Write an enzyme that holds these catalytic residues in place. Sequence first.
Site, PDB file in Angstrom:
ATOM      1  N   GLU A   1       0.838  -1.199   0.000  1.00 20.22           N
ATOM      2  CA  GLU A   1       0.000   0.000   0.000  1.00 20.22           C
ATOM      3  C   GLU A   1       0.882   1.261   0.000  1.00 20.22           C
ATOM      4  O   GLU A   1       0.607   2.230  -0.728  1.00 20.22           O
ATOM      5  CB  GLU A   1      -0.897  -0.057   1.227  1.00 20.22           C
ATOM      6  CG  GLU A   1      -1.390   1.272   1.782  1.00 20.22           C
ATOM      7  CD  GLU A   1      -1.853   1.112   3.232  1.00 20.22           C
ATOM      8  OE1 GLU A   1      -2.884   0.417   3.451  1.00 20.22           O
ATOM      9  OE2 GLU A   1      -1.151   1.604   4.144  1.00 20.22           O
TER      10      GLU A   1
ATOM     11  N   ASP B   1      -5.821  -3.041  -3.266  1.00 23.88           N
ATOM     12  CA  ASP B   1      -5.726  -1.579  -3.315  1.00 23.88           C
ATOM     13  C   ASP B   1      -4.324  -1.069  -3.668  1.00 23.88           C
ATOM     14  O   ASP B   1      -4.183  -0.102  -4.426  1.00 23.88           O
ATOM     15  CB  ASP B   1      -6.292  -0.924  -2.046  1.00 23.88           C
ATOM     16  CG  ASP B   1      -5.560  -1.311  -0.767  1.00 23.88           C
ATOM     17  OD1 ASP B   1      -4.935  -2.385  -0.667  1.00 23.88           O
ATOM     18  OD2 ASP B   1      -5.655  -0.528   0.198  1.00 23.88           O
TER      19      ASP B   1
END
EC number: 3.2.1.4
Length: 363
Positions: free
Chosen positions: A63, A120
């Site tokens: 991330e 993500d």
Amino acid sequence: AGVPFNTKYPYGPTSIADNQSEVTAMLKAEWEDWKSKRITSNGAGGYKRVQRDASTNYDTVSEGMGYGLLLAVCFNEQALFDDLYRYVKSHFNGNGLMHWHIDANNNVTSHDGGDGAATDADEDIALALIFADKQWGSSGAINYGQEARTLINNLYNHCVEHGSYVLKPGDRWGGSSVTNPSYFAPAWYKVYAQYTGDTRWNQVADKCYQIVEEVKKYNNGTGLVPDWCTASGTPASGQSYDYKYDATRYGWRTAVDYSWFGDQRAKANCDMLTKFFARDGAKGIVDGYTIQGSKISNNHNASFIGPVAAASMTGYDLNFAKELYRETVAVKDSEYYGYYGNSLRLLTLLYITGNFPNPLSDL
């Protein structure tokens, strides 16, 4: 190239900053600060990596790489971008997606499935590569376009549930039984569709809105989304169903869809969320709520302010939007916990000041 982009979003306001002339200087100073604290060559295998903070012993999560690549390209730091990407490439797993968790010594963590990917992160890395291709071109050391096309394909093949188009939270688990609304990036998917010619990505975007539409049956009109839920908008076993550190990102990813594409589902969702926070005001924002609106934590920090300011871009109340811009600049977390919130603060600041344009538009 890069900040300041001097572009205008096709829908909504381009900037909610109260003083546009000082914004650029402020962004550059915040970027220099972020760079010195977060970027390191220690434990990077000859390249560079984005490290977390002291609270997690300066490890790296995929991330963080996604955030760092997006920031590096927006600030026109090609050499830094390339080194960060070489670290990502040195961490692609069997499915061509990044190991989600690596320690400060460059060893993938084993206790938590660190070799699996987190959706993500890879979707942010893919978008950063598209920006790189558009801004700098792909004829240099790294062919950004080719890397982007390859990653987008792997994302679709391993992180999207076939048949339903439900976004999976990882390459090896989840989907209809458990997904994460904060990962939903409809604006990213539309860009993927246009960039690669693969229209299946538009279906994924529609499916994200359909899932949030289900969540609306349970959030009592607040616009709040849970950290985790099933495709039916109900609780995922053993996962938080509250609006906490994961869910906070929803307003930022959703608002961008309105700014770039004028999607009315994005405006409807963001206006709802903004209206909820308008009750207590910018100073009243805390770090934890049930989706029906009850406060369950009471800290006022950077992980929760910027995303609400991003959501305010869709136009519920432009006066409240200015107050939110001011609060976003004002609240910066202490260094011990300086990774997460301060990273979201800088990303949202780029967006709300008009410095995060569609990479496929005229830059």
